[PDB]
TrEMBL record, chain G:
Lineage of origin: Bacteria, Pseudomonadati, Pseudomonadota, Gammaproteobacteria, Enterobacterales
Residues of the full protein shown: 53 to 328 of 362
Gene it is expressed from: rpoS
GO cellular component, one term: cytoplasm
Region (Sigma-70 factor domain-4): 201-254
Name assigned to this protein: RNA polymerase sigma factor RpoS
Keyword Transcription regulation included in the entry's annotation: yes
Intracellular or extracellular location(s): Cytoplasm
Organism expressing this protein natively: Escherichia coli
Length: 1362, 50, 49, 79, 99, 49, 268
RNA sequence: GAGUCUG
DNA sequence: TCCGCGTCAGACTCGTTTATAGCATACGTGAG
DNA sequence: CTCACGTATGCTATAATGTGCTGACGCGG
């Protein structure tokens, strides 16, 4: 049996007959009385096999003795009953029947083959109209439809010498007569003469179809069914329920439909019935077969018993619920259990509490086995009865089996790999699973009723894979980032915080101790507080140049709780780690440091110790939460009455006339948002310190030990944001629309919320909860699309030996460098030997791992940019090299060859999204969004550097910017870039280019609300095309009458103004056009949707003035809800509604033709004589001006860039870096750390395919799409041997299409669109050789990765011989 | 009787449970005074006063 | 939904034109629904049921 | 080892190969009844193979060499 | 709830679901991917084959575990044999091509 | 349900993430002891045999 | 856009000629003599009648189209056995045939398990009786109450009402149901242990005792013989075979008492 | 298939 | 207009209501 | 070797001859 590949192809009528073991003539199932199969019925034993093992129906032959003995009397083979699941039958159809899958499934094969529209074919099939099959007399040609009356006319006149028919016989004849060869040549001849752009595609597609049809060896006639296969009985079973009733598959109802109508058709043919009735029966027969194959595709599905449509054949394969997703890519599993989880703080990190009764059952065979080796059990049934009786000796045996046997714990949902971990079990009395606290983070396990799956690895191999790869201890670091996942929390944090943190004097201030032991003795004796500021003598052990630890001892001011923690601290670590007051943030660093210095076993022990000491001192403290905790500020009511009269004055000014709904909304929200921060900061000063404690004599200030303040400052639970709502002011609440309520909640929980404030709260709350239920599914669907696309990607090679790589620079987004170069390049293979500034001595090699030690050296030299080897630029065909990837972030060393990288990438991108969906949503009530960014103040002195900027000087003296992309940088002395600052359009700069500014100077102010339209030229203002009511609107005031103009866009605009662009035009005193300095462009500024102009026509402007104000309403939430669709849009490589344009070829450009306003930018290169001419929208305005020597992919247009255009012109590293940065923008906004290398994996999978120009020595020709690896392989052998050279161009595929473009149809089918995938594979006669992971998991084989990579590579070499 | 974790309050922002606990103790405080007066019989007049 | 009339409007949705198309829906307790609606070109249309 | 298998990964290197080699050795003791080089100390065949790898007694190359030896001794006996 | 071996499903031959039917826990796509990220190829095949559909495999491996062999001897998952039959019932020839 | 003397404070991780630490006295006093009554049927049917 | 098989067919039937009395007689005389066109015209003209009866015969078993086609088969038999010599009209005679063939088809095809019309006809009378009982007895018919009214056996009435229960769809219910013909690994493993033990048990008892005992039950032999049939091999005895069969079992009973089964494996 | 649920 | 997609386990319950003629010969297998 | 039992195909005659639940998802290609 063991096979190489699988192929799919159209079934021949005769092929179908081969599988069949008889024709089922009758609809009879079984006999009502003897519930045995009827004669030649659907469950016929004569056809499908015996009902009972080695027994004929009439009962003449019994027992295993009779083997293959076909009983003469009843006609039933004496074999196993198993056969009735494998043997098929068939049905002889009277009329040929079209196979819905090839007819209806778009595009369709029957239609595309005949070049005949579907409508025409259907009219033929339902017997509405005749079709001409062939007429030697060109009078009627081919495939020309004739109605009932059209058929009568030609029939008298010509007749006979022209053949036209109706129904599936007609189409089968038409398919039989069609010559695939000749039409191929005719269509090639057409493309040679006149290749029209869009119909070249469709002609090339029918050519590919015809070619592929002939290569597959499929025949078009076979699309029409003459023989209809019958599924084996056990796969459509009729079984008796206990109640005496029977229950059956709906396939039985569909087969019975088909047989009844088919047999009735045979009858009406024997009876010579009139043709109207024959026709009706042929329609009904096709309806029944189409229902049986795919019910609901051919229109209204056939409803059975309830009214629900009958489940057809295709429905069992297709749906998510089909067989692929449900029974094949995942399954129900033996030696599996579940229960509620609960803490096991006593456990070590590699252990878990497993209930006695649960473990008894899971390890049943293992017990039976030892019982028989000890001779305590005579046999298995006696062993089973000893377990049933739960005898005392059995417990002792079970304890012996479980020893050193790992068990897998799993929690839903399994978002990333740490959702499964292996533990050594600890037998426990009681029904709950005990989980180690430190792994609760990876499972996202909280013990308010969550449950876990248990699974038992049976084989020695599976035990070892669990202990080595999947063990808790061994999966410490997150594979998505370099930070660890196992980190103490809650009490473990509170207790260590309580121990380390210092208090004024207390018991035994300023004593001296001999080491931590005198300290612990003092504390436990009751002569010292843990916050006793005293100096102790601790002995630290630092590592020297060699492996040896160098001894060191010295004195240092500290406390009595930090010295005692030093006792837990392993040798190698500095004392400075425990010398601060420890929080969760500091302890995570402590365990990571310990892991990288000392190694795995020490950190494991250290982690346990920290947990034990944590809770030990947590219960020794005894902190609680009272009503005196939240202390609301004395100066709340003042701040509020001030804020409240202020907002009142603006509401009175609203009836006066300076205010729109949007303006006042912004102004009131600003007032309350600043009041809330003020009251919060009042509360936090009053609470954080405001500790008056008398030091040894006089008064002092120190930090408050108020309980809630300690909870917040420690990071144990609530944040400052929660405590604002407790003790300060609750703030502005946001409606389910996302728009914020104008009246904020002045009160806090302590004071008490009313029914109005509470009712208003509810909106936000419930939208949050609904968000968790509903939104969770798009996140998860993105994980699944990612996984499917990057399943194949495995580490295949150690070193491809590539120099190529991406230049990484410190990510200084905004003002402060959130992530520097060290973190971004931390653990990355360095290529193209990059040394220090002074180019005269190599600092780093071209084949080394970027380790923390190398990274520390990089920082002394301050290297800004480094070319590093990346996954995207790796040359390895059919996988990636360990060097291009770099460190396995989860392991902390170079990646192992055979590791399934793609999966890890998809999971690690996918997880945060899916977790941040449920997470931020249930946890938040209101929306604490900030928007103070409206004026750049510089933090450190330096000189202003403005890259990409075109500004005009205004009458103020000031530099008013009119560039779109503007980057203000802060250079020091030496000349490095250190701060960045995105200046907007419409900005006032304080100082111009390259001018000195001091620390804390404002360098540019701009309004955040309103992006003004700022004019370059000076003169008078003219209203072009600005017809009132057509394009704008007029709104008038009282006494004198100030009118204001609002530009209605095409949304509100009439049909009349649609074609008019409204624009403020600059004319001079004469009323001639003023030019834009130095160009032929006349000044004219095109006003968009709702551009609210105050100043009416004819007003003398100066340059640099604000013409028009476009309302910039930013009413969007700062959540993943808005972020994830951006992430999905980048991964799926979507062109925006306004993608930027770039030069295709280098060379010198002038303008040619214009369509009214639409630019036809003509590039005429220097060397390359052929031009490149582009149509461009009128309103899209160019960055470039005219004759410049611009290279390939210079930015011409504004607005967002399409990843396609980036790849196509600049190239791989450009587009990869665009995706990485644009995605990472979103995740970084939510505080999510994902390494770039994961995103890079998936982009590599996006850039899998490439289109080809010209031919080589293979079958390329014009514009075939082939995978990049395979064309490179061809190019390698070509370049050595010669032959026709082939130009190529890489194509970008966004995720969904990239996954369907994989050359495995088992993966394509299992993903989505299964019906369409199998028709296209069946027609192509496609052969799946089973190379990817999903394919191997489907056939239930060893994965080509991890453990399986060894075995799999041995099979690939067994292909070379034997 | 029960030891519950302080850290499952300020994050959860259900402060009701803490007020319930303070009042619950006060309620039981007064029940403990009545229980003490009933154990020592004392006066119907005095119980009535309290 | 209580029977009676309801006047609703796709707020954009259809036609990147961004036209608000107004509609009336007459909902009985029992019977076919009677819809009136506008088209981008300001033609009044009826959809029975 | 008992707790953690880091040391045994440091001997061979590839986690995947560590598993194959420890598997192969555990199978010898499980089936063939091959005697353990380290004291058993009531340890399962999975842990004993990892001890033997940690201390550097068991390895893919070494196992192959001894397979050839036992197999040639059996060839000798048959001829 | 806990289960070592039990009754098995009618068509798919996989163990049943739910504690009332004495069911095996569902090993879902998500859970499979985790084993894919790791190394764990034998654990995954186990879960696909002798633990679910593979009929001969599961009995043979049970016997081996009582015999103390802890060896898998994998086979072909039965859900697949059904898939094939269901695609041939559609009139698509889907054959296994041998080595 | 039943009101109880409750103290807010950590224990040795026995109240980790919402996990609850209860006194034996609660079990003794049979407070939160609960009564459940299950219904099982046995059906005598008539079969072909 | 007429795509529906039903609307197409009914369009085609409407497009027919409607027959009169004198026309029916003329065509019917030609039809019985064996005219092609006469048969075609009588059938095509009377299709409308099939539809009227088939329209009021829906929602009971098959679909309208399935009920119309079977009804059309009755029309054909009606035209074949029509008597134009009798003054009585065709529509009257045809109605019988159309209802007969539709009803017969609805009694067979509708149920997955072939049910006999004999039982169906009996069932009809039981149900009509139940209806009359229900109108006067505010409650519903009991089995015994129906049996009393028809003067028939209670058991016979119960058997019939027991066949009234329809079949249920597995598609889900399939996943609740489990294979009952396929034994579990644990059970199959237990049989392996017993079969293996027997082979060892046969070479533990005496050479003549395990020969005779095994080949009788069909344990080692090919066919399960009886005490008298063991004589075919070499035994050729009736008394000596029966003494030696039981002597093999008595020594084996002590082998199960010592190993630790006997009463331990008696419960099993 | 329609429920009421726990993450 | 049409059709391809929409997170992962777990608990329980319900459900497969309704309709139609009577008696003669013919076809076919099973039991004693 | 013969009859009973289960199952099926047959024929009867006022005239009648044209159908027919739940509706509303949303984004992309
Ligand atoms: Mg939870
Ligand atoms: Mg929370
Ligand atoms: Zn037979």
């Amino acid at each position: 049996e063991e096979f190489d590949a699988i192929k799919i192809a159209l079934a021949s009528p005769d092929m179908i007959r081969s599988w069949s073991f008889g024709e089922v003539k009758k609809p009879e199932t079984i006999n009502y009385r003897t519930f045995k199969p009827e004669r030649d019925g659907l469950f016929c034993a004569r056809i499908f096999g015996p009902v009972k093992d080695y027994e004929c129906l009439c009962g003449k032959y019994k027992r295993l003795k009779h083997r293959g003995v076909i009983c003469e009397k009843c006609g039933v083979e004496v074999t196993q009953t198993k056969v009735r699941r494998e043997r098929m039958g068939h049905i002889e159809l009277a009329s040929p029947t079209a196979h819905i899958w090839f007819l209806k499934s778009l595009p369709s094969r029957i239609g595309l083959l005949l070049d005949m529209p579907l409508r025409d074919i259907e009219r033929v099939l339902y017997f509405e109209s005749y079709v001409v099959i062939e007429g030697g007399m060109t009078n009627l040609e081919r495939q020309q439809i004739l109605t009932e009356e059209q058929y009568l006319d030609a029939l008298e006149e010509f007749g006979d010498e022209f053949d036209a028919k109706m129904g599936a016989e007609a189409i089968q004849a038409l398919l039989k007569s069609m010559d695939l060869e000749q039409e191929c040549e005719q269509l090639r001849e057409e493309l040679n003469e006149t290749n029209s752009e869009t119909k070249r595609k469709k002609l090339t597609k029918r050519i590919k179809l015809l070619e592929a049809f002939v290569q597959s060896g499929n025949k078009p006639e076979w699309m029409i069914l003459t023989v209809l296969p019958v599924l084996p009985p056990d796969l459509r079973p009729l079984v008796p329920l206990d109640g005496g009733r029977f229950a059956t598959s709906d396939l039985n109802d569909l087969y019975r439909r088909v047989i009844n109508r088919n047999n009735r058709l045979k009858r009406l043919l024997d009876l010579a019935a009139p043709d109207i009735i024959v026709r009706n029966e042929k329609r009904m027969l096709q309806e029944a077969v189409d229902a049986l194959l795919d019910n609901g595709r051919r229109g209204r599905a056939i409803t059975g018993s309830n009214k629900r449509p009958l489940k057809s054949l295709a429905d069992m394969i297709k749906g998510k619920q089909g067989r692929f997703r449900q029974n094949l890519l995942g399954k129900r599993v033996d030696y599996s259990g579940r229960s509620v989880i609960t803490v096991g703080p006593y456990l070590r990190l590699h252990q878990c509490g497993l209930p006695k009764k649960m473990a008894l059952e899971l390890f049943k065979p293992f017990i039976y086995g030892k019982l028989e080796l000890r001779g305590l059990a005579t046999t298995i049934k006696a062993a089973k009865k000893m377990v049933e009786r739960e005898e005392a000796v059995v417990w002792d045996i079970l304890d012996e089996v479980i020893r050193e046997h790992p068990v897998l714990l799993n929690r839903a949902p399994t978002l990333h790999r740490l959702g499964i971990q292996a533990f050594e079990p600890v037998l426990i009395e009681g029904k709950a699973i005990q989980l180690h606290p430190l792994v609760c983070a990876a499972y996202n396990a909280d013990f308010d009723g969550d449950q876990m799956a248990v699974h038992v690895p049976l084989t020695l191999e599976a035990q070892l894979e669990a202990r080595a790869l999947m063990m808790s201890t061994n999966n410490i670091l997150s594979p998505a980032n370099g930070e660890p996942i196992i980190v103490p929390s809650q009490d473990v944090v509170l207790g260590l915080y309580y121990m380390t943190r210092d208090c004024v004097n207390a018991k035994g201030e300023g004593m001296v101790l001999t080491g931590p032991k005198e300290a612990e003795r003092l504390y436990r004796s009751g002569l010292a507080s843990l916050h006793a500021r005293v100096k102790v003598r601790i002995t630290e052990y630092e590592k020297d140049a060699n492996g040896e630890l160098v001894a060191k001892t010295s004195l240092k001011d500290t406390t009595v709780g930090r010295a005692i923690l030093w006792m837990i601290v392993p040798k190698g670590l500095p004392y400075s780690i425990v010398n601060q007051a420890l929080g969760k943030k500091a302890i995570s660093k402590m365990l990571n440091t310990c892991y990288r210095i000392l190694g795995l076993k020490p950190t494991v022990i250290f982690a346990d110790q920290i947990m034990y000491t944590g809770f030990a001192y947590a219960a020794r403290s005894g902190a609680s939460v009272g009503i005196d905790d939240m202390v609301i500020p004395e100066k709340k009511h003042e701040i509020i009455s001030e804020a409240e009269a202020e907002v009142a004055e603006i509401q009175e000014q609203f009836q006066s006339g300076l205010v729109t709904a949007g303006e006042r909304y912004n102004k009131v929200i600003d007032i309350w948002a600043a009041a809330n921060d003020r009251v919060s900061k009042a509360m936090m000063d009053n609470l954080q310190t405001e500790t008056v404690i008398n030091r040894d004599g006089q008064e002092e200030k120190q930090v408050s030990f108020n309980s809630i303040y300690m909870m917040a400052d420690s990071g144990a639970r609530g944040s400052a944001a929660q405590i604002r709502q407790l003790a300060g002011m609750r703030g502005l609440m946001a409606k389910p629309d996302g728009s914020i309520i104008e009246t904020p909640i002045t009160a806090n929980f302590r004071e008490g919320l009313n029914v109005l404030q509470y009712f208003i709260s509810t909106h936000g709350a419930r939208k949050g909860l609904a968000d968790t239920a509903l939104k969770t599914a798009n996140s998860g669907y993105l994980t699944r699309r990612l996984v499917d696309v990057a399943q194949d990607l495995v580490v295949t090679e150690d070193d491809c030996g590539t120099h190529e790589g991406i230049m990484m620079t410190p990510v200084i987004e905004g003002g402060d460098v959130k992530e520097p170069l060290r973190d971004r390049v931390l653990g990355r293979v360095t290529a193209e030997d990059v040394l220090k500034p002074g180019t005269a001595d190599i600092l780093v090699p071209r084949n080394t791992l970027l380790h923390e030690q190398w990274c520390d050296l990089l920082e002394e030299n301050s290297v800004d940019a480094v070319k590093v080897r990346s996954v995207v630029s790796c040359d390895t065909d059919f996988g990636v090299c360990a060097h291009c990837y770099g460190r396995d972030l989860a392991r902390g060393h170079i990646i192992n060859k055979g590791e399934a990288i793609g999966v890890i990438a998809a999971q690690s991108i996918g997880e945060p999204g899916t977790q941040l969906t449920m997470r931020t949503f249930h946890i938040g009530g209101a929306a604490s969004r900030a928007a103070a960014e409206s004026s750049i103040q510089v933090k450190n002195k330096g000189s202003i550097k403005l890259s990409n900027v075109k500004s005009v000087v205004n009458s103020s003296g000031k530099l008013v910017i009119t560039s779109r992309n503007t980057e203000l940088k802060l250079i020091d002395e030496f000349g490095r870039t250190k701060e960045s600052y995105k200046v907007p359009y419409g900005a006032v700069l304080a100082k111009g280019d390259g001018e000195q500014v001091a620390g804390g100077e404002t360098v540019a102010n701009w309004d955040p609300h309103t992006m003004p339209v700022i004019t370059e030229v000076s003169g008078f203002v003219r209203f072009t095309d600005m017809i009132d009511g057509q394009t704008i609107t007029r709104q008038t005031d009282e006494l004198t009458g100030l009118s204001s103009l609002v530009v209605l866009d095409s949304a509100e605009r009439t049909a009349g103004g649609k074609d008019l662009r409204p624009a403020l035009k600059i004319v001079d005193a004469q009323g001639n056009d003023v030019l834009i300095p130095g160009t032929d462009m006349p000044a004219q500024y095109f006003l968009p949707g709702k551009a609210i102009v105050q100043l009416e026509d004819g007003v003398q402007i100066s340059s640099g003035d604000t013409l028009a104000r476009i309302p910039q309403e930013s009413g969007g939430t700062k959540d993943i809800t808005g972020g994830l669709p951006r992430v999905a849009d980048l991964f799926e490589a979507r062109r925006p509604k306004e993608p930027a344009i770039l030069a295709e070829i280098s060379g010198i450009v002038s303008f040619g033709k214009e369509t009214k306003g639409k630019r036809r930018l003509v590039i005429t290169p220097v060397d390359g004589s052929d031009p490149y001419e582009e149509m461009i929208p009128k309103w899209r305005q160019l960055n470039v001006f005219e004759g410049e020597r611009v290279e390939r992919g210079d930015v011409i247009s504004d607005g967002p860039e399409a990843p396609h255009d980036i790849l196509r012109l600049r190239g791989v590293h450009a587009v990869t870096r665009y995706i990485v940065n644009e995605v990472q923008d979103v995740y970084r906004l939510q505080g999510v750390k994902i390494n770039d290398k994961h995103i890079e994996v998936i982009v590599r999978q996006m850039l899998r395919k490439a289109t080809i120009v010209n031919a080589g020595s293979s079958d390329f020709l014009e514009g075939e799409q082939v995978e990049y690896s395979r064309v490179k392989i061809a190019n390698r052998e070509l370049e050595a041997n010669g032959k026709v050279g082939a130009t190529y161009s890489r194509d970008l595929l966004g995720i969904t299409k990239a996954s369907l473009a994989t050359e495995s149809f088992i993966s394509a089918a299992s993903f989505q669109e299964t019906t369409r995938v199998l028709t296209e594979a069946a027609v192509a006669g496609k052969r799946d050789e089973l190379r990817g992971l999903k394919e191997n998991v489907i056939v239930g084989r060893l994965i080509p990765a991890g453990t399986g990579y060894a075995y799999h590579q041995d099979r690939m070499r067994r292909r070379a011989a034997g | 009787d029960i030891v519950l974790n302080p850290l499952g309050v300020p994050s959860r922002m259900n402060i009701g449970q803490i007020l319930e606990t303070h009042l619950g103790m006060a309620a039981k405080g007064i029940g403990d005074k009545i229980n003490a007066m009933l154990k020592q019989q004392q006066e119907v007049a005095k119980l009535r006063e309290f | 939904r209580s029977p009676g009339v309801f006047f609703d409007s796709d707020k954009g949705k259809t036609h990147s034109s961004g036209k608000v198309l107004y509609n009336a829906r007459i909902i009985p307790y029992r019977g076919s629904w009677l819809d009136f609606e506008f088209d981008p070109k300001d033609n009044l249309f009826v959809r029975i049921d | 080892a008992r707790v953690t298998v880091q040391d045994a990964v440091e001997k061979i290197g590839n986690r995947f190969d560590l598993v194959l080699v420890a598997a192969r050795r555990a199978r010898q003791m499980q089936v063939g009844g091959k005697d353990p080089l380290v004291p058993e100390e009531n340890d399962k065949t999975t842990v004993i193979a990892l001890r033997e790898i940690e201390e550097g007694l068991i390895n893919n190359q070494i196992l192959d060499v001894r397979e050839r030896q036992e197999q040639q001794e059996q060839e000798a006996a048959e001829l | 709830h806990a289960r070592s071996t039990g009754s098995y499903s009618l068509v798919t031959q996989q163990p049943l679901g739910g504690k009332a039917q004495f069911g095996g826990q569902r090993f879902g796509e998500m859970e499979v991917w985790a084993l894919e990220a790791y190394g764990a190829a034998y654990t995954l095949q186990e879960m696909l084959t002798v633990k679910s559909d593979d009929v001969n495999g599961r009995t043979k491996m049970y016997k081996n575990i009582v015999d103390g062999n802890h060896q898998m001897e994998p086979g072909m998952p039965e859900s697949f044999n059904v898939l094939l039959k269901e695609i041939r019932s559609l009139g698509i020839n889907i054959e296994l091509e041998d080595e | 349900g039943q009101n109880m003397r409750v103290a807010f404070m950590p224990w040795n991780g026995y109240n980790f993430e919402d996990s609850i630490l209860v006194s034996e006295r609660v079990v003794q006093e049979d407070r939160f002891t609960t009564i459940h009554i299950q219904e099982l049927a046995c059906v005598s049917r008539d079969t072909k045999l | 856009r007429v795509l529906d098989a039903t609307q197409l067919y009914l369009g085609e039937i409407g497009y027919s000629p409607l027959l009169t009395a004198e026309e029916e007689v003329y065509f019917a005389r030609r039809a019985l003599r064996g005219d092609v066109a006469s048969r075609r015209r009588m059938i095509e003209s009377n299709l409308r009648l099939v539809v009227k009866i088939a329209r009021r015969y829906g929602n009971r078993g098959l679909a309208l189209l399935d009920l119309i086609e079977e009804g059309n088969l009755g029309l054909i038999r009606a035209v074949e056995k029509f008597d134009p010599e009798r003054g009585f009209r065709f529509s009257t005679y045809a109605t019988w045939w159309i209802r007969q063939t539709i009803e017969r088809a609805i009694m067979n095809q509708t149920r997955t398990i072939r049910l006999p019309i004999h039982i169906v006809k009996e069932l009809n009378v039981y149900l009509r009786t139940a209806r009359e009982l229900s109108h006067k007895l505010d409650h519903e018919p009991s089995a015994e109450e129906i049996a009393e009214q028809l003067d028939k056996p209670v058991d016979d009435v119960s058997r019939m009402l027991r066949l009234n229960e329809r079949g249920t769809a597995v598609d889900a219910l399939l996943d609740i149901l489990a294979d009952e013909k396929e034994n579990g690994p644990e059970d199959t493993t237990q049989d392996d242990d017993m079969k293996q033990s027997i082979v060892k048990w046969l070479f533990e008892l005496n050479a003549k005792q395990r020969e005779v005992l095994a080949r009788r039950f069909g344990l080692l032999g090919y066919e399960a013989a009886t005490l008298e049939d063991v004589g075919r091999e070499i035994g050729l005895t009736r008394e000596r075979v029966r003494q030696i069969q039981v002597e093999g079992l008595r020594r084996l009973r002590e082998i199960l008492q010592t190993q630790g089964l006997n009463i331990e494996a008696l419960f099993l």
